Amino acid sequence: DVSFRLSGADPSSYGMFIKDLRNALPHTEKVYNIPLLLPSVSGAGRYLLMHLFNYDGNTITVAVDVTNVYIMGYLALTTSYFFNEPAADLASQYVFRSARRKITLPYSGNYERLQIAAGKPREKIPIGLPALDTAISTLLHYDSTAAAGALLVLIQTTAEAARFKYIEQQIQERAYRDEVPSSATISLENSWSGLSKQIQLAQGNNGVFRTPTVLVDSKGNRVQITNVTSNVVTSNIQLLLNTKNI
Ligand SMILES: NC[C@H]1O[C@H](O[C@H]2[C@H](O)[C@@H](O[C@H]3O[C@H](CO)[C@@H](O)[C@H](N)[C@H]3O)[C@H](N)C[C@@H]2N)[C@H](O)[C@H](O)[C@@H]1O
Ligand SMILES: *[C@@H]1O[C@H](CO)[C@@H](O)[C@H](O)[C@H]1NC(C)=O
């Protein structure tokens, strides 16, 4: 298990948590020095439990599929909540089994679904450590509309930060003040599977992408990533979705 406490949190302790999160994900290879997530894990070992504590010390446990980072559901007091999707129902067979009741959320875990439920795109949802504190609090008491927005915050401040060093730094900058994610942040989130695939296709292609990945940069400019010498590959991305799962 990995843990993060919002009480007394700072860029350092958050950095420690994201490091722990990455280190809890199993790999047997690195591709271009980046850990390659496993094709599959069987049984309960497939799911990492993240223990998150809001400022007041209240807690949720979040279940994360270790092969893809995907958060399937969470436990709040004695109630479990899972996304409305086959992978999450499968997760419900292994985690939070001692919960008194199980609620299936009325949406899948997809942005194309969470943004609809929340009533807003995540370009307009501020993220940061204060937002994460809020998200935890929201998820403690069931409210499906509010939970959608909370989950958008949760996903980006945990999973997306684990995958991209840039996103981790974005959140560290938002330690004490929330701000909507940069265009670059959104771009990276949307491109993770694409980038993972192309970095893997590059291993037999002299480090060259079979298909270029288009990203927005930090200055707000749109750029083509064509090979492994790009800063996104050498410095930014921290985890690769296995092509078996793409
Ligand atoms: N991004 C990683 C983090 O956020 C995901 O959310 C995103 C899923 O990445 C994407 O992929 C799958 O999402 C759902 C899970 O299968 C499915 O509904 C969907 N059909 C799939 O495409 C989807 N496209 C958008 C959604 N924004 C997670 O579940 C998660 O908790 C994880 O830590
Ligand atoms: C690789 O990417 C860099 C940009 O990061 C670019 O300057 C260069 O032209 C690319 N090389 C190839 C072979 O595509």
Automatic annotation (TrEMBL):
One biological process term in Gene Ontology: defense response
Keyword set includes Plastid: no
Residues reported to bind UTP: V69, I71, Y111, E160, R163
GO MF term set: nucleotide binding; rRNA N-glycosylase activity; toxin activity
One Pfam family, short name: RIP
Binding site for adenine 2: I71, G109
Residues noted as binding CMP in the record, renumbered to the chain: Y70, I71, E85, Y111, E112, R163
Residues binding cytidine, per UniProt: Y70, I71, E85, Y111, E160, R163
Source domain of life: Eukaryota
EC id: 3.2.2.22
Residues that hold guanine according to the record: I71, G109, E160, R163
Residues where L-ascorbate binds: I71, G109, Y111
Binding site for UDP: V69, Y111, R163
Positions of beta-D-fructose binding: G109, Y111, R163
Record: glycosylation sites: N227
Sequence similarity: Belongs to the ribosome-inactivating protein family. Type 1 RIP subfamily.
Name used for this protein in its record: rRNA N-glycosylase
Organism for this UniProt entry: Momordica balsamina
